[PDB]
Design a protein around this ligand. Structure first.
Ligand SMILES: *[C@@H]1O[C@H](CO)[C@@H](O[C@@H]2O[C@H](CO)[C@@H](O)[C@H](O)[C@H]2NC(C)=O)[C@H](O)[C@H]1NC(C)=O
Lengths: 49, 49
C-alpha cells in the first residue's frame, strides 16, 4: 500500500513537470528564436530579444 | 502502528489549498496600481454603465 501511494504521487508530479517543460519549450521557441508580439509572454513590457 | 501515512495526506491537502490561492493571485493580480474612471462619461457616445 505504501509503494502504491508513492507511485501515484510520483506520476502526478511527473505530469506537472511535463506541463512545465512544454511551456518552457514554447518559450524557448518563440521568445529566443525570434521576436514575439504576444504581450507579457516574454517578460513585462515590449519584448526585444 | 501504520506509520506516518497521515502526514502525506495532510501535506497534499495543504498543497492543494495553497495552489488555489496561487491560481487566483496569478490570474487576477496583473496590474501594480489601481485606476478609477473619471466622473465624466463623455466617451463619444459609448456607454459602459
Ligand atoms: C447608458 O445605458 C443605461 C442603460 O443600460 C442608461 O440608463 C437608462 O436611462 C434611461 C433614461 O436616462 C432610463 O429610462 C433607463 O431605465 C435606464 N436604464 C437602466 C438599466 O438604468 C443610461 O442613461 C446610459 N447612459 C448614457 C450616457 O448613454
Amino acid at each position: 500500500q505504501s509503494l502504491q501511494t508513492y507511485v501515484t504521487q510520483q506520476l502526478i508530479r511527473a505530469a506537472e513537470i511535463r506541463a512545465s517543460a512544454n511551456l518552457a519549450a514554447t518559450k524557448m521557441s518563440e521568445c529566443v528564436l525570434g521576436q514575439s508580439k504576444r504581450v507579457d509572454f516574454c517578460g513585462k513590457g515590449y519584448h526585444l530579444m | 502502528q501504520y506509520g506516518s501515512f497521515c502526514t502525506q495526506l495532510n501535506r497534499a491537502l495543504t498543497g492543494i489549498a495553497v495552489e488555489q490561492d496561487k491560481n487566483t493571485q496569478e490570474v487576477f493580480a496583473q496590474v501594480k496600481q489601481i485606476y478609477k474612471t473619471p466622473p465624466i462619461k463623455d466617451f463619444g457616445g459609448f456607454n459602459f454603465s
